[model samples]
Target chain A: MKNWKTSAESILTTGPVVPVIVVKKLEHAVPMAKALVAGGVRVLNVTLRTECAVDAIRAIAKEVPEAIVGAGTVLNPQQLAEVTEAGAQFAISPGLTEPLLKAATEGTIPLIPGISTVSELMLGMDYGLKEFKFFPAEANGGVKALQAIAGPFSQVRFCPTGGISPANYRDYLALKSVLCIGGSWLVPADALEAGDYDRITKLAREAVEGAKL
Target chain B: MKNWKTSAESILTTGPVVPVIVVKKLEHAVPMAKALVAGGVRVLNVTLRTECAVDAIRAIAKEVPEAIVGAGTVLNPQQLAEVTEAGAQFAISPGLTEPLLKAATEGTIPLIPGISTVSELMLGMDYGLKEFKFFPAEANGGVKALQAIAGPFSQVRFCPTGGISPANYRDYLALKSVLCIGGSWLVPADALEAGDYDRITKLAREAVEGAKL
Candidate 1:
């Protein structure tokens, strides 16, 4: 129930890496969160793309005290409410919809909406959101799109996600509008499926360090 | 006003090409309409991307009874209402929103809404629209995405726009679900600025013949 801007800004200063987690197994949630937190990162976006996403969020919030968890790919009002009930601290989506906008403005949690084009970003700006996610980032013009935004929408900020990895997080982190980035490389599906918490934590620490600290 | 589905179906039957026009001068609208009609293409999509768009639609509707003109890039409810008042026969946008959806349903204009993802296409289907515009056509996985839609959504037809040119209209036309595409190639900026109606007509004719006759 915290203010959207306040919650988003806290994550902005938390660190330059908001590890986008996709919890395949419920048991891995707390360990992964702890690993990320242990590496000087705190913001975790538990994407609702999988069946176990909400359960993972609930487990992480209750079990991982150092993690500031949020829900990702939240496309509807129902999901927003579900994540909030499940104890998620914030919500993000690929882009804004009229219903999603209404849900965002009137809802309890911070909605760090996603957008790609100038027109879509402008529409988001009209919704009073200062923080956003540049989704499908690399595919949808990547850095060029972000550079394009700096001219007309300098006041806005973003967490560019999708197609991001440890190899390229530095480039994204260097942007003025970019506060942090969302990427799944830290918790690759195979790495998580194998239950290699040590490897996952090591990758998390390396990624945080490689993002130019 | 014709039902959006019926009108879209009728226009598609007339010609496989939907000439996308960017009206450069208000006076050229009628002649441009005459040229497209002369070249056996009847449907004209006047994009709101230009400042002269509304006036262009007005000119074409007033002067060319043979051409069926619609508004393109009808992003919001306000633009939809404006296009209808300016005598647009139908309307189209790269995507849809609740307010835009509500606006389309309440107005006389038949909105050929755009869809990118399955969920978006589903939303369009939920709204009772069978005709759609697969916008940013090449960017959003192109023919692959359109082909994939066959698995779950064979009932919907598409007008794939963006990154589509006359050179590849046939490839797009060959797609089972695609009706006609919305494109800016038919009326390039320089041609319109030069008042080269003959060249524009030739482009329109080539597009008409390139698609399945």
Candidate 2:
């Protein structure tokens, strides 16, 4: 089992929706983190899909103390190190690898890697992880698939992401094994471009509120 | 990179359909292999799902010399070793893992392990494998998902199994990246119970013939 500052389960338990954030501009990072936190989404997943993503993590971690900023789309041990050094409290990947898993076991933060099959899940479990991200969930068979895949492992929890939207987020939340879901809807590129922090805040608030119903 | 006795590509190239065989009774092994061979389906994948599975593999390998009998649902390095000792020409897993990958590299047979994500595929490729099994194909987003997953790896070929049938086998074969498909319809449990070797042959023939059209 990996010793970490916080458990991946605790990080996911803090959400019913963790926005799959893509930061194109470094300037928007702190403000966007602040805006999401302002509307009740304290856990922010900043994806390293853009050039300024690492800088954004650095900026947010420095300025937005209220927001629990984590790195999303983290693929390997190196990215995990970079994000942790940049002050990410947690990290997520679209899929898992051995080196990445080993690194997480030795690192300071929790790594929530994605898995699409029972074998992949079993491998992570061997490494002592009870929480995982179900990547490309909709494409990889949606709710029923997750149900059957999770049927054997009662203690394991998941964050189902990919092809998720506002209209269907609740369907996944209803599942006993689902701790949260990752969606790109809350941080729309247009909303960021327009610097509409209020819109981001509203979406975040609505997402959290909607999951309760 | 592992040196395989026969290229995984060669095994898959000989098929458009590999029957996912589950032998409950050890006696059904040889006749079933011969029956499928009679119908132009030479590649037989005996799954390790039942108690007599390894026994069936040993029987078929000793009794039926012409039939190319491989093992299916090979989970780990241990199972891979077991199947190889039992005389499996190749091994297929529902998903990939590192120690299994390492074992396959050092072992005698080709391990066409299953992959559901680009990261999984990448990990296998890192181990020098070009052939893979896309397990639970329907549950893992079906044809479109495979198309996108294979889009980046132009040379990688697949044996798509799970939820494949007479109805949709050709749709997957139609894709350039898919060398073959795995289906259980050819070796129905009822057919084996009834000792209907003719039915198995006929189904295998129809499957092979249909893939041509």
Give the best candidate by lDDT: 2
Off by over 4 Å in 1: A1-91, A94-101, A107-110, A115-159, A166-181, A184-213, B1-6, B24-28, B152-155
What TM-score fits each model?
Answer: 0.65, 0.63
lDDT of 1 by residue, B1-213 (tens): 234434656655556777667676788788888888888778998878677899999888888988899888677788888888899988877676656777787777688877666777777667677888776676666787688865677777888876678676678888889877877777878887878889888988887777655
Error of 2 at B38 (Å): 9.3
* Local accuracy of candidate 2 as per-residue lDDT tens digits, A1-213: 367998888899997899999989888888999899999998899999999899999999999998889999898899999999999999999988878988988999998999889778868876889899997999877888888567446678999999989887889999999999999999999999889999999999999998885
lDDT per model vs. reference: 0.78, 0.89
Fnat per candidate, as a fraction, reads 0.00, 0.35
Best by TM-score: 1
TM-score (C-alpha) between model 1 and the true structure? 0.65
Q: Which residue runs of candidate 2 sit more than 4 Å off their true CA positions?
A: A21-42, A47-69, A73-79, A82-87, A94-102, A114-163, A168-179, A187-202, B1-16, B21-69, B73-76, B94-102, B114-158, B171-179, B187-213
List pairs with backbone clashes in candidate 1: none
**For model 2, what is the alpha-carbon lDDT of residue A151?**
48
Model 2, residue B80: distance off in Å is 2.0
Q: Which ten residues in a row have the lowest lDDT in candidate 1 chain A?
A: A144-153
